[PDB]
């Protein structure tokens, strides 16, 4: 006879690991790749040149 | 041949001013005018002489 793993089982803890959770927040790929402007109010006016000399 | 204010318009932002911006005035007067009693409970009884011999 021997003390089996099933006999000792109450003596044995499970563990925990986060390896399959994401390590970092995503971001909008448009924010990552196009120019970003920090707005101070709901509407910003942006002039564009339309015709020239 | 001349440019104009209409051609240049997208270059021309409007200003903002507080000169006529007034908050509401405190027009309330009975608490400053009349005798004030600081109530300590929902109801206060005021005995008065009603009739005399």
From TrEMBL, chains A, B:
It is found in: Virion. This is Major capsid protein. The chain holds residues 2 to 54 of 324 of the full protein.
């Amino acid at each position: 006879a021997d003390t089996n793993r099933t006999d000792a089982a109450a003596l044995i803890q499970e563990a925990y690991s986060d390896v399959f959770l994401d390590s970092v927040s995503e971001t909008a790929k448009v924010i990552g790749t196009f120019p970003v402007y920090n707005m101070g109010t709901k509407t910003t006016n942006l002039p564009v040149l339309s015709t020239f000399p």
